[PDB]
Scaffold this active site. Structure first.
Site, mmCIF file in Angstrom:
data_model
loop_
_atom_site.group_PDB
_atom_site.id
_atom_site.type_symbol
_atom_site.label_atom_id
_atom_site.label_comp_id
_atom_site.label_asym_id
_atom_site.label_seq_id
_atom_site.Cartn_x
_atom_site.Cartn_y
_atom_site.Cartn_z
ATOM 1 N N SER A 80 1.544 39.966 36.923
ATOM 2 C CA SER A 80 1.439 41.361 37.315
ATOM 3 C C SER A 80 2.352 41.658 38.496
ATOM 4 C CB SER A 80 0.000 41.714 37.689
ATOM 5 O OG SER A 80 -0.053 42.948 38.383
ATOM 6 N N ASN B 19 -3.070 44.485 25.778
ATOM 7 C CA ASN B 19 -2.582 43.115 25.690
ATOM 8 C C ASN B 19 -2.126 42.785 24.275
ATOM 9 O OD1 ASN B 19 -3.347 42.826 28.417
ATOM 10 N ND2 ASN B 19 -5.420 42.219 27.814
ATOM 11 N N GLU C 70 20.322 33.774 24.652
ATOM 12 C CA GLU C 70 21.230 34.858 24.302
ATOM 13 C C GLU C 70 20.869 36.145 25.027
ATOM 14 O OE1 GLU C 70 21.452 35.318 20.094
ATOM 15 O OE2 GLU C 70 21.960 33.216 19.718
HETATM 16 N N1 LIG Z 1 -1.175 45.270 30.999
HETATM 17 C C1 LIG Z 1 -2.187 44.737 31.677
HETATM 18 N N2 LIG Z 1 -2.212 44.810 33.058
HETATM 19 C C2 LIG Z 1 -3.240 44.269 33.758
HETATM 20 C C3 LIG Z 1 -4.270 43.638 33.079
HETATM 21 N N3 LIG Z 1 -5.151 43.194 33.995
HETATM 22 C C4 LIG Z 1 -4.707 43.522 35.228
HETATM 23 N N4 LIG Z 1 -3.525 44.197 35.103
HETATM 24 C C5 LIG Z 1 -2.706 44.727 36.213
HETATM 25 O O1 LIG Z 1 -2.762 43.887 37.355
HETATM 26 C C6 LIG Z 1 -2.613 44.682 38.516
HETATM 27 C C7 LIG Z 1 -3.197 44.043 39.770
HETATM 28 O O2 LIG Z 1 -2.979 42.654 39.784
HETATM 29 P P1 LIG Z 1 -4.128 41.701 39.200
HETATM 30 O O3 LIG Z 1 -3.622 40.903 38.023
HETATM 31 O O4 LIG Z 1 -5.304 42.559 38.808
HETATM 32 O O5 LIG Z 1 -4.555 40.751 40.425
HETATM 33 P P2 LIG Z 1 -4.324 39.164 40.333
HETATM 34 O O6 LIG Z 1 -2.981 38.864 39.717
HETATM 35 O O7 LIG Z 1 -5.445 38.522 39.549
HETATM 36 O O8 LIG Z 1 -4.367 38.649 41.855
HETATM 37 P P3 LIG Z 1 -5.741 38.724 42.684
HETATM 38 O O9 LIG Z 1 -5.778 40.006 43.472
HETATM 39 O O10 LIG Z 1 -5.829 37.563 43.642
HETATM 40 O O11 LIG Z 1 -6.901 38.680 41.719
HETATM 41 C C8 LIG Z 1 -3.336 45.967 38.187
HETATM 42 O O12 LIG Z 1 -2.707 47.053 38.822
HETATM 43 C C9 LIG Z 1 -3.235 46.077 36.679
HETATM 44 O O13 LIG Z 1 -2.339 47.104 36.333
HETATM 45 C C10 LIG Z 1 -4.248 43.561 31.693
HETATM 46 O O14 LIG Z 1 -5.158 43.004 31.088
HETATM 47 N N5 LIG Z 1 -3.206 44.114 30.993
#
Ligand SMILES: Nc1nc2c(ncn2[C@@H]2O[C@H](COP(=O)(O)OP(=O)(O)OP(=O)(O)O)[C@@H](O)[C@H]2O)c(=O)[nH]1
Ligand SMILES: Nc1nc2c(ncn2[C@@H]2O[C@H](COP(=O)(O)OP(=O)(O)OP(=O)(O)O)[C@@H](O)[C@H]2O)c(=O)[nH]1
Ligand SMILES: Nc1nc2c(ncn2[C@@H]2O[C@H](COP(=O)(O)OP(=O)(O)O)[C@@H](O)[C@H]2O)c(=O)[nH]1
Ligand SMILES: Nc1nc2c(ncn2[C@@H]2O[C@H](COP(=O)(O)OP(=O)(O)O)[C@@H](O)[C@H]2O)c(=O)[nH]1
Ligand SMILES: [Mg+2]
Ligand SMILES: [Mg+2]
Lengths: 430, 432, 432, 430
Positions: B133, B221, B247
């Site tokens: 993310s 997802n 590529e």
């Molecule tokens: N496309 C998509 N984005 C996601 C999903 N879950 C979380 N996100 C995105 O992740 C962003 C925030 O980062 P996170 O992944 O939730 O936090 P983390 O990477 O687990 O890090 P921590 O804060 O320590 O838990 C959010 O703004 C969401 O947009 C998902 O299942 N699909």
């Protein structure tokens, strides 16, 4: 991992704490005897957050119950879920504080805090990964205000990097339960602004309106109010105990909710809250939950958010929901009420969605708000304090226990600084 | 012979990984475990053992242990190697510093070891697929920490990453601008090509074409899972015009610091409305270049294209592709940059897209995934930089970052680098 | 190879569309869905899909959602493409301004997109068939808004429209004169040929020849459906002397601003009284030029004909047509204009007219549809203009129109244009 | 889409409103408990126009019930279909208006209107596409005349582009139910001519004649009259809720029925209306329905159309009919009575045909008429007002609440302008 150690203080804290563990034990399936009889296995996976295991399936709360008098604890152990606690954790004295901060902090609790820490450290050292400390108390009394702040200073000095969160019952503006509230509150605030990361301010008067307006409750006991407080206490610690689409650790809230170190006072809320006769007139969907969460009439604090701006906001949802609805609704609130949100923060909402809702509710949501309008609470206290302090209203009781008039001036000065700081960051860039 | 090492960092990457590995298992006939009941296709992503157990060639890492613990209890519990699932003690608390400096320093040496144990077991290494993310936490800090380690141990080997870019309006955290820029600063020189997706854009697609008014993260997802399958289809399956992971680098990256292609998947169509559509090659190909179907909320027509990769699947005739692209080239609205007369990379694969049971996508005969590098994305970076400037002007949340190993100088360095990147986008957008 | 894009706007056009597409489905053997049970004929109006589903090449648009919603729930629910059925939020409230300026601006960009998606799917584009009401609302405002958009995107391509012209005496709305003139002003330069029908005239026909004392709107639409089938029969079916849609333009339009032919359908005869009639070519052909059988309540003998198109069907011998027209030419009562010695366009088709089950028309062997451009219609425009002058002299309802995006100047411009049109009709009606 | 929000006011409005929802619920198949038990599916397709959905199939009216006294609402909820309403929508005070416009508007309802809008906005914001507001009240009292007009001004200022339609019970000429009717009516009219798009004027005296002459009803209760009013209220909003050959939205009527902004006062009617013993002597066909609709003895307003001319007319038919009969009959009325129709309007009839008739009737038709003869009603009120105002009959009650004699003159002047305007447009061109 990510264990939380609960610390009671005073009559108010113990009363709320007893209700808190009744709620927590309910959602984890723990019987009042300590046995587990829940259905789902997810409620037992992260049970170590609040409980320690014992032989025969007995789960013991990681709670420390302390007060300078034996009566309130004696009521706690006699009441429901009173035997669940470990007897060794009942650290109490004999001569109580007379609702003066000086006695609980300097004179009476000073000789008892050492024993309390001997139980806090023992509980803390038994954790695989300590997350923080949870304190429930009241600012209007002696024990909670005095002794509670003494423990905060001791723990923060002994666990600098752990997150300290407090759930404090704040004096109401309309009417008082104690003549010396301004002295107790101002002195207590002087210690919180320096030795805690997030304090959830709540006042009894606001909870009476919630019972009167929304719940339509005609005979609200103190047990009813403690249920509302317990609900928000549980909500802020669900991602640690249950899975969800978007988790939010206690520290995850602090970073998103505390821009500057001293602006960490929050006013909580809960939803859904409806009367028994009006339940069959509600859709009970995300759009309406978010509609009342931001309502000024559904927050457990007296300060109206309309009088200031939100620095940050958190919405911890519970139950299976459409993440699209949550994101859209939060954005919709942001757009409509753009005047209520500080502009130099582009996004003012932090969203967390837990999969498992509270028992009996398909959906639930907890509201946390760091608003510049909370300065109204502090400034009102300052006016009451200065009026009494301007002609030595009751200082002989406080100065008789060892305090000095210099300390009172320091406490007042720090409070004024906090009120001014809230006003500074309420204005736009340049 | 070919291989890909998939590292899924954070909640977004881990949760996206479940969708991806639920689809790879489907496409290869696997049974939610390592068992195939009574072939060189599955070898790209799955390692094999004498017992008949096919082990994913992926590493699930998260400082938080809630999401990975769910995998250990879910249907795919017996699939992954237990040591591949690496869980920390405490999360990054949505802080870049914690993921990179404080907590990441106690898990990076462990995850890199399993990457070492996987790399040496491959007949030939092809690249990395990193899912994370952009919002912050582990996806911003730990990813940068791990990416730099890979760039040293594995050097010139390809390193592709898939990122959930912050949405323009929707936002789930308050300090995303801080984390987004910080990871961008430390990943430009260590990443070869990063594919972007936005939550807001896919929400619109899931409600504009898929007739679903209640998208969850599971729905998004699965849409992302299809894209990665289309990207990696050439390695897994035979085709008419195959495209390799190495590529994508020279085809979509004209300059080293501009390596952020957009993403698109044309036949995102509901089952019911698919009965009234021909779904021929020209219409799906034309759908890619429409703003209404982009997976990132950045309008392509605000800027000029500079590289497009069309990855077809199923019953696709190359003659149709040749004509379909040519007519697109004719349109004056679709404006490519002057210095790229050669703007299209075409990949055709025979394997059609498989629909996950319980999903929403129709049983499409042919699908195309477009990876477009466009100058319009510079506006999105400008918006992101603008948010950083407002908060940093007041030092909104700096005390958290500075208190966990980071320094004030990084904020100035990080933003100055992004300003150069925005300037670099301006230079590429002009000719003579 | 041939095609026609049908846009049905408003309640009248949409409801007329149901009659039309209930008849096209009948003539081509379709089963009320896209299914033909176990051919180049149906291709003109229906697109085909691999599943065997034939999709109408039509767009149903209405700012109101009541009438189109009924289609989504009726027998033809599974026929139309769901995105073809476009519904707005609120209706035009019988106001030209709302359809054109306020509400139409939020739906035109959507309907034109589906026209774009249909136009590019055709092997060869032939023209447009637009069905709308002249009374007002969506049929006056939105049609003008859409017509001008087509004239830009598709230019010289044919644009035919069928309109329910206001009746002389019968009227269902109070502000029809305002809307009728406003749409006429903005459609003269964007329409190639508009065919007119009146509710009052068809009521008389349905009660004078069809022996029915209780006509509904369903009965009228079926009569209109036959006319369009006769017009488009040449494309759909083989014949002896075929006529294309682009031929109507130069044959019936002598001058650009006089393109309002009347409509007639000769064998409108009940089943019982058809047993006592020969129904030969001469008698049906002679019936067309009688005032009692015109579909528009404008007496032809008040003016001079300037163009007539006879579209025959079924067992028709061209020798009979040649003699039948010649004797009509001899009659001195049927007066053509001096400058058009060449006044007849003849089209013969082998496919007989199909009777809709549950209808009123008899199982006629041969039918003729006459499209006559006559100077007599100028009187009808004069009557319509007279109504506008009375209301506008007092500014009867101007505050509604002015309050929704329109301006007072348009009323003066709109009426001045019609005055020129009436003058233009006078010039064409005189020689030397 | 095209939702309507219903707003009650006063005793008269609440009484009619309760009957209105009994009729509406009947044709939509809603039980008094809120459940749906209808047969046809068409009555559930557009149910969102008047109702909001709740869990378990409960459908809640989008109605707000307000009055300054609790009694009338208490009667409403106790009576049939009284539990269907949402309790939160009962916004009421304690001290009622004493039938003086000043108290309900300036003194008593001024402190209660803010609460009412908090429910109106909440209802409005829940609509996918808000069409307009529906207000039922009376001009002869304090609450309906005073408080109702206050809400009209507030909503029209807050929703400028939405259509506001009012169903007002107008004072009768023959006899009065209140001594201060001229004061209440004239002041109320001063607000309607400016802040509503279509007001349907009805007087109790006219409804008594309908019951006496046509229905031959010998014991007409107020419930019987409210049924007639409810019938016309339902008729004007059928095209929004059921399909038909030729639809007519509320705005579609306003454009065709309101040539000039201030001439928007209508006198309604209904058909068929026959006694129980004379039903077997009627053909019940379109030709005779239209025959009595234009009869001056079948209109729910006192003013006789024969004394003036129709500016416009609307005939909303219900039930399956021959459109030829409707068009011919409307034209036949136009031709015969050409002296009764304003000449500078070429067509004076707007026709709407809905497919589904009211329960128990094969055919039905509602008549709406904007006639210049309605000036007789306004001029009669003006004569009564000036006689009382000429010597300060009761102003101390109104001026004691904050009103001024200047306001009374302004109200009278505006009324005279409206009467004059109706007379101006009653003459032919030039
Ligand atoms: N496309 C998509 N984005 C996601 C999903 N879950 C979380 N996100 C995105 O992740 C962003 C925030 O980062 P996170 O992944 O939730 O936090 P983390 O990477 O687990 O890090 P921590 O804060 O320590 O838990 C959010 O703004 C969401 O947009 C998902 O299942 N699909
Ligand atoms: N032949 C025929 N004419 C119809 C039919 N329905 C409506 N009309 C005509 O349409 C004219 C008015 O325009 P409408 O179609 O009703 O209004 P609209 O196009 O829906 O536009 P809005 O006012 O916004 O609803 C009337 O005068 C009718 O003569 C029908 O089913 N058949
Ligand atoms: N909700 C709740 N609040 C309480 C209870 N007991 C005391 N309080 C609050 O606590 C404040 C009084 O301080 P208190 O705790 O009794 O003094 P202390 O014993 O020295 O801490 C008042 O504001 C009370 O409203 C209780 O049982 N429930
Ligand atoms: N149909 C009906 N009309 C009523 C009822 N009560 C009052 N009215 C009418 O309302 C008018 C009196 O105004 P009222 O509503 O009582 O004054 P308010 O209480 O201040 O609104 C008279 O014209 C009555 O005919 C009722 O129960 N039913
Ligand atoms: Mg996480
Ligand atoms: Mg309509």
């Amino acid at each position: 991992m990510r264990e939380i150690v609960h610390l009671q203080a005073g009559q108010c804290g113990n009363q709320i704490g007893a209700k808190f563990w009744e709620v927590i034990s309910d959602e984890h399936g723990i019987d009042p005897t300590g046995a587990y009889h829940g259905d789902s296995d997810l409620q037992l996976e992260r049970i170590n957050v609040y409980y320690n295991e014992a032989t025969g399936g007995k789960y013991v709360p990681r709670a420390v119950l302390v007060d300078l008098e034996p009566g309130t604890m004696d009521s706690v152990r006699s009441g429901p879920f009173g035997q669940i606690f470990r007897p060794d954790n009942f650290v109490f004295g004999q001569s109580g504080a007379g609702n003066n901060w000086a006695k609980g902090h300097y004179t009476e609790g000073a000789e008892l805090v050492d024993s309390v820490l001997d139980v806090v450290r023992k509980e803390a050292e038994s954790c695989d990964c300590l997350q923080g400390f949870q304190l429930t108390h009241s600012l209007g009394g002696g024990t909670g205000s005095g002794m509670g702040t003494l423990l905060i200073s001791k723990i923060r000095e002994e666990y600098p990097d752990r997150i300290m969160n407090t759930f404090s019952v704040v004096p109401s503006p309309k009417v008082s339960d104690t003549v010396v509230e301004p002295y107790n509150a101002t002195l207590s605030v002087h210690q919180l602004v320096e030795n805690t990361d997030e304090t959830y301010c709540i006042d009894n008067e606001a909870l009476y309106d919630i019972c009167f307006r929304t719940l339509k409750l005609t005979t609200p006991t103190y047990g009813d109010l403690n249920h509302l407080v317990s609900a928000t206490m549980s909500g802020v610690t669900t991602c640690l105990r249950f899975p969800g689409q978007l988790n939010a650790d206690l520290r995850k809230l602090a970073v998103n909710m505390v821009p500057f170190p001293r602006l960490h006072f929050f006013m909580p809320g809960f939803a859904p809250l409806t009367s028994r006769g009006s339940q069959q007139y509600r859709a009970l969907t995300v759009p309406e939950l978010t509609q009342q969460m931001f309502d000024a009439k559904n927050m457990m604090a007296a300060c109206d958010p309309r009088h200031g701006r939100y620095l940050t906001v958190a919405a911890i949802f519970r139950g299976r929901m459409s993440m699209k609805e949550v994101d859209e609704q939060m954005l919709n609130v942001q757009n409509k009420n753009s005047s209520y949100f500080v502009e130099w923060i582009p996004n003012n909402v932090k969203t967390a969605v837990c999969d498992i809702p509270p028992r009996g509710l398909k959906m639930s949501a907890t509201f946390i708000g760091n608003s510049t309008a909370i300065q109204e609470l502090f400034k009102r206290i300052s006016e009451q304090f200065t009026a009494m302090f301007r002609r030595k209203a009751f200082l002989h009781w406080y100065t008789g226990e060892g305090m000095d008039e210099m300390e009172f001036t320091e406490a007042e000065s720090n409070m004024n600084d906090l009120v001014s700081e809230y006003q500074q960051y309420q204005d736009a860039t340049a | 012979m070919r291989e890909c090492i998939s590292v899924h960092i954070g909640q977004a990457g881990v949760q996206m990984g479940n969708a991806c590995w639920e689809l790879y298992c489907l496409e290869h006939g696997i049974q939610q475990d390592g068992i195939i009941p009574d072939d060189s296709s599955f070898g790209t992503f799955f390692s094999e053992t004498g017992s008949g157990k096919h082990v994913p060639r992926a590493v699930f890492v998260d400082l938080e242990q809630t999401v990975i613990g769910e995998i250990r209890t879910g249907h795919y519990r017996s699939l992954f190697h237990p040591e591949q699932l690496i869980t920390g003690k405490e999360d990054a608390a949505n802080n870049y510093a914690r993921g990179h400096y404080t907590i990441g320093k106690e898990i990076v040496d462990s995850v890199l070891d399993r990457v070492r144990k996987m790399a040496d077991q491959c007949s030939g290494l092809q690249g990395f697929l990193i899912f994370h993310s952009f919002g912050g936490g582990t996806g911003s800090g730990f990813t940068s920490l791990l990416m730099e380690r890979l760039s040293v141990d594995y050097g010139k080997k390809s390193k592709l990453e898939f990122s959930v870019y912050p949405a323009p309006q929707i936002s789930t955290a308050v300090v995303e601008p801080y984390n987004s820029i910080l990871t961008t600063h430390t990943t430009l020189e260590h990443s070869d090509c990063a594919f972007m997706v936005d939550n807001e854009a896919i929400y619109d697609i899931c409600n504009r074409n898929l007739d679903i008014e209640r998208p969850t993260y599971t729905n998004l997802n699965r849409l992302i899972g299809q894209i990665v399958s289309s990207i990696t289809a050439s390695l897994r399956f035979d085709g008419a015009l195959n495209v390799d992971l190495t590529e994508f680098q020279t085809n979509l990256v004209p300059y080293p610091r501009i390596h952020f292609p957009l993403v698109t998947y044309s036949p995102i169509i509901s089952a019911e409305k698919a009965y009234h559509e021909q779904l021929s090659v020209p219409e799906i190909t034309n759908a890619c270049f429409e703003y209404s179907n982009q997976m990132v909320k950045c309008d392509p027509r605000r800027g000029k294209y500079m590289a497009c990769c069309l990855l077809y699947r199923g019953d696709v005739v190359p003659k149709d592709v040749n004509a379909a692209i040519a007519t697109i080239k004719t349109r004056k609205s679709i404006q490519f940059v002057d210095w790229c007369p050669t703007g299209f990379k075409v990949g055709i694969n025979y394997q059609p897209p498989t629909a996950v049971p319980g999903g929403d996508l129709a049983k499409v005969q042919r699908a195309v995934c477009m990876l477009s590098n466009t100058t319009a994305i510079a506006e999105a970076w400008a918006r992101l930089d603008h948010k950083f400037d407002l908060m940093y002007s007041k030092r909104a949340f700096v005390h958290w970052y500075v208190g966990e190993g980071m320094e004030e100088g990084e904020f100035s360095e990080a933003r100055e680098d992004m300003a150069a990147l925005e300037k670099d986008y301006e230079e590429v957008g002009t000719e003579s």
